[PDB]
Amino acid sequence: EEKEILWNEAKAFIAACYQELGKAAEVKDRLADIKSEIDLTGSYVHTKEELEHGAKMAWRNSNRCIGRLFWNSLNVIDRRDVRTKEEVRDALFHHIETATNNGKIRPTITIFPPEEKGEKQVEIWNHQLIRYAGYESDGERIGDPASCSLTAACEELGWRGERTDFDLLPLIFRMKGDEQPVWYELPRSLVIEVPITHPDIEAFSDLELKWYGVPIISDMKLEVGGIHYNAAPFNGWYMGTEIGARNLADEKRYDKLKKVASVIGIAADYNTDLWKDQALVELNKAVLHSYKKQGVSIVDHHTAASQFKRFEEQAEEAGRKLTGDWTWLIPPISPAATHIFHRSYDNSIVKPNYFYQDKPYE
Amino acid sequence: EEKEILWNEAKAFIAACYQELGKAAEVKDRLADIKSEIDLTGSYVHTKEELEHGAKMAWRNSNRCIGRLFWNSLNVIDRRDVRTKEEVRDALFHHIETATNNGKIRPTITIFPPEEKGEKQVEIWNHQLIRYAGYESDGERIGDPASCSLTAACEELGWRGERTDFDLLPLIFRMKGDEQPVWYELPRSLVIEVPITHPDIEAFSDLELKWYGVPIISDMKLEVGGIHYNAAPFNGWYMGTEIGARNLADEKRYDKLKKVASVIGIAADYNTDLWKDQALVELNKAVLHSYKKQGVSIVDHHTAASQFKRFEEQAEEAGRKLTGDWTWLIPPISPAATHIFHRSYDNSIVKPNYFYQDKPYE
Numbered sequence: 001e002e003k004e005i006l007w008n009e010a011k012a013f014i015a016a017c018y019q020e021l022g023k024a025a026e027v028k029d030r031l032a033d034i035k036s037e038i039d040l041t042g043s044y045v046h047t048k049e050e051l052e053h054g055a056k057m058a059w060r061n062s063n064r065c066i067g068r069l070f071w072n073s074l075n076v077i078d079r080r081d082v083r084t085k086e087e088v089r090d091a092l093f094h095h096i097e098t099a100t101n102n103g104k105i106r107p108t109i110t111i112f113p114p115e116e117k118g119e120k121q122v123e124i125w126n127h128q129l130i131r132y133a134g135y136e137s138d139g140e141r142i143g144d145p146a147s148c149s150l151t152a153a154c155e156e157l158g159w160r161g162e163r164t165d166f167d168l169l170p171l172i173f174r175m176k177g178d179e180q181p182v183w184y185e186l187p188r189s190l191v192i193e194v195p196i197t198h199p200d201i202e203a204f205s206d207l208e209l210k211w212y213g214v215p216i217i218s219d220m221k222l223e224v225g226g227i228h229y230n231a232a233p234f235n236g237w238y239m240g241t242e243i244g245a246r247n248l249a250d251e252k253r254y255d256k257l258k259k260v261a262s263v264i265g266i267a268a269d270y271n272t273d274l275w276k277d278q279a280l281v282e283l284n285k286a287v288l289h290s291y292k293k294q295g296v297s298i299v300d301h302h303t304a305a306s307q308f309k310r311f312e313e314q315a316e317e318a319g320r321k322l323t324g325d326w327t328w329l330i331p332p333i334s335p336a337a338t339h340i341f342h343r344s345y346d347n348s349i350v351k352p353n354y355f356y357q358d359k360p361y362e
Numbered sequence: 363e364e365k366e367i368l369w370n371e372a373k374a375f376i377a378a379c380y381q382e383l384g385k386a387a388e389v390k391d392r393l394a395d396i397k398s399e400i401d402l403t404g405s406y407v408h409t410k411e412e413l414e415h416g417a418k419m420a421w422r423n424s425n426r427c428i429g430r431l432f433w434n435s436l437n438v439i440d441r442r443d444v445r446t447k448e449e450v451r452d453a454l455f456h457h458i459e460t461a462t463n464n465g466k467i468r469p470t471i472t473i474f475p476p477e478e479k480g481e482k483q484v485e486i487w488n489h490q491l492i493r494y495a496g497y498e499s500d501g502e503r504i505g506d507p508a509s510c511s512l513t514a515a516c517e518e519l520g521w522r523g524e525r526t527d528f529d530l531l532p533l534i535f536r537m538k539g540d541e542q543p544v545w546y547e548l549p550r551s552l553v554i555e556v557p558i559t560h561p562d563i564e565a566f567s568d569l570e571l572k573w574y575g576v577p578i579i580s581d582m583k584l585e586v587g588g589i590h591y592n593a594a595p596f597n598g599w600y601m602g603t604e605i606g607a608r609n610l611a612d613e614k615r616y617d618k619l620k621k622v623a624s625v626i627g628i629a630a631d632y633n634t635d636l637w638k639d640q641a642l643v644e645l646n647k648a649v650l651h652s653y654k655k656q657g658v659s660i661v662d663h664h665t666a667a668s669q670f671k672r673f674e675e676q677a678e679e680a681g682r683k684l685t686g687d688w689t690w691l692i693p694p695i696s697p698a699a700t701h702i703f704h705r706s707y708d709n710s711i712v713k714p715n716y717f718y719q720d721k722p723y724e
């Protein structure tokens with residue numbers, strides 16, 4: 001049955017991929033080649049063209065992503081050749097470097113060898129290649145609470161964090177055959193961080209807030225034509241709200257809204273004063289201002305929504321069905337000021353796509 | 363089949379209603395009475411107790427309502443006895459008066475005779491008993507655009523609006539047997555309006571904004587035990603965002619955000635300045651402040667969310683399944699600052715409930 005799934009998915013993908021690439025006539029021969037290869041080896045190997053476009057199609061089908069307009073300009077790095085943890089580490093290091101691009105962020109995906117028969121060749125433990133550690137012990141909470149479990153797992157493996165609020169987690173991944181994952185400290189020269197300041201309010205720097213430049217999802221599975229790339233880290237640039245309205249605002253994250261209200265000089269006593277709402281706006285203005293001042297790529301949620309509208313138009317123009325998750329597409333601040341809020345979306349799963357997978361820790 | 367639907371719904375409602383009222387033992391006899399009455403007349407008549415609790419159950423099942431905590435304190439006015447348009451008008455006038463309660467708004471529903479065999483006894487054309495007219499002609503737009511079609515329909519019937527931005531629409535409803543609906547101008551002494559001022563910014567009054575005190579939905583069908591009350595106007599108090607973030611903010615409504623940005627002294631040039639977001643906050647602070655200053659009941663979205671959390675707890679406590687529409691429950695500003703955003707809801711339709719129905723105009 002597993003083979004049948006692979007072949008069925010392969011047929012659907014190769015047809016669709018080759019149609020889009022204008023290689024329609026080559027479908028029959030390519031499928032035959034694949035049909036034998038599956039019959040022989042229990043799997044098949046993508047061409048670079050199929051892989052590159054498959055990763056682009058997968059971004060295009062990401063229902064929760066508001067930034068899908070630029071799906072076709074995705075930078076794909078093919079690292080199916082890696083065999084050693086040294087190679088994995090250097091690929092991950094390289095991904096950070098080239099994607100960061102001195103602030104002018106390049107949407108990039110590095111693709112590692114896929115699962116053979118459910119067996120992972122490489123298993124990345126990081127949720128993001130760049131993320132802050134989190135600590136919770138006897139009342140004392142430090143750093144990013146969302147990283148508490150991974151941090152504890154890393155401290156099992158001989159790593160120790162400095163316990164600032166912004167400890168960079170090391171890269172941690174496990175190779176096929178090894179029982180334990182290895183970990184490597186990130187070179188600080190590879191990680192751009194942005195100090196959060198406010199354009200008008202000088203006291204905002206007293207919060208001593210900062211965030212990393214590049215969000216690189218590293219725990220999701222890329223599925224292309226029945227092939228499971230469990231290790232394929234990808235990145236874009238931040239939408240400001242992700243940092244200002246969530247990472248730094250959520251009670252179960254950095255929980256900074258009360259201190260923001262204090263530095264911007266407003267009371268945090270009454271719900272009717274809408275101080276949380278005011279704090280969210282100024283903090284999100286601070287985030288956008290800070291990234292721009294440092295020359296690190298970022299987009300506000302209004303501009304992002306406009307771009308997503310173009311994506312919707314582009315999709316209809318090309319005769320493709322649009323899919324999307326309304327609950328995720330709406331920004332967490334002023335969503336009714338975007339068009340997204342005022343229309344509906346089909347939340348169907350189309351492949352190729354990126355999927356969740358179980359954590360090896362926890 | 364229609365009778366079978368009525369009887370099936372009647373069985374489900376009477377059982378459930380009487381369980382909750384602790385009148386469990388009376389279910390059998392009451393159902394027999396109903397079974398004969400349906401067999402005889404093609405319908406059945408609710409007791410005052412069933413009607414009152416049915417309307418309360420219906421509010422409790424309103425998936426899109428964030429204010430369901432106070433479902434059991436709903437003030438039910440039984441006007442199934444009305445036969446004349448004079449009686450309908452005076453009932454509607456009375457509803458406005460008693461619900462307004464000099465600002466201390468009482469959640470109230472006035473229930474008119476139900477459909478007999480799909481035939482409406484009374485047909486209310488108003489979307490809300492109190493709403494502003496809207497005009498669009500050769501480029502010129504005046505008032506509330508959402509009322510454009512109803513306003514045009516009213517001006518067919520001999521009514522004429524003054525064409526201010528806040529013309530009160532007349533009550534307009536049609537009686538069984540009449541081809542045309544009648545219309546009655548609202549007494550201004552019955553309608554509380556709130557001038558919008560800002561607590562800190564004096565120039566906000568230059569916008570000359572205002573809104574009516576009491577939102578009274580009048581075009582929805584209340585369904586109770588198979589009985590269709592197509593005319594049953596209900597009201598609560600406003601959540602501030604409904605006015606500040608939607609009615610006065612939407613481009614297809616009053617579209618006031620640019621003028622708000624001007625009076626609060628910020629530029630409306632760059633998306634990255636988040637001026638819309640800032641304008642939304644100050645305008646919503648203005649709305650809340652204004653209603654409080656006038657002693658007209660209103661609730662901010664944070665407090666409302668807290669109350670809705672209690673409703674969720676109350677529901678689990680009493681062993682009732684919770685249903686809700688996530689897309690409607692989240693407030694249009696700072697939704698991620700509420701618990702609603704961070705959990706999911708089953709959007710199943712439970713009866714009794716309130717439903718949409720076709721407009722007689724349009």
Ligand code: HEM
Pocket residue numbers: 055058059062064065066067068070074107108109234235236237238239242299304328354
């Ligand atoms: C170009 C800049 C990009 C922007 C501004 C953007 C924007 C967003 C945002 C705001 C989210 C929601 C994240 C959250 O709430 O946690 C998101 C989710 C997502 N984006 Fe993008 N994105 C970008 C690039 C990409 C790229 C390059 C890919 C992959 C090829 C991608 C795939 C996804 C996926 C899979 C999710 C869902 C993750 C999840 O389920 O939690 N995006 N995007």
Ligand code: HEM
Pocket residue numbers: 417420421424426427428429430432436469470471596597598599600601604661666690716
């Ligand atoms: C007590 C004060 C109340 C508050 C603060 C409240 C809050 C809300 C809000 C904010 C909405 C969304 C409206 C919109 O976005 O257009 C809503 C919808 C709704 N509420 Fe309530 N509500 C209250 C009382 C009531 C009452 C008394 C009923 C009926 C018995 C009711 C039934 C509904 C229904 C049926 C809807 C959905 C209307 C639609 O589908 O568009 N609510 N409520």
Ligand SMILES: Cc1cc(N)nc(COc2cccc(OCC3CCNCC3)c2)c1
Pocket residue numbers: 215216217219220234235236237238239242356357
């Ligand atoms: C590619 C990208 C761009 C962007 N602007 N922002 C992001 C952030 O995306 C996130 C941020 C946090 C969680 C998440 O979901 C992936 C995990 C998978 C395991 N379950 C929890 C969610 C995805 C990514």
Ligand SMILES: Cc1cc(N)nc(COc2cccc(OCC3CCNCC3)c2)c1
Pocket residue numbers: 577578579581582596597598599600601604718719
């Ligand atoms: C009872 C109540 C309380 C409250 N705070 N706010 C409202 C406002 O509710 C609305 C406000 C606008 C539209 C609407 O929906 C009913 C119509 C039915 C016909 N289709 C369009 C929506 C419901 C009601």
Ligand SMILES: C[C@H](O)[C@H](O)[C@H]1CNc2nc(N)[nH]c(=O)c2N1
Pocket residue numbers: 341342343344689690691
């Ligand atoms: C398409 C989408 O369902 C629509 O814009 C909804 C979203 N959530 C909402 N929520 C409320 N309270 N009121 C609304 O009118 C809407 N509109």
Ligand SMILES: C[C@H](O)[C@H](O)[C@H]1CNc2nc(N)[nH]c(=O)c2N1
Pocket residue numbers: 327328329703704705706
């Ligand atoms: C329960 C609900 O789906 C959950 O809170 C979602 C809502 N929408 C979201 N949207 C984004 N972009 N990111 C999120 O983490 C969430 N969380």
Ligand SMILES: [Cl-]
Pocket residue numbers: 215242247
């Ligand atoms: Cl993030």
Ligand SMILES: [Cl-]
Pocket residue numbers: 577604609
């Ligand atoms: Cl309204």
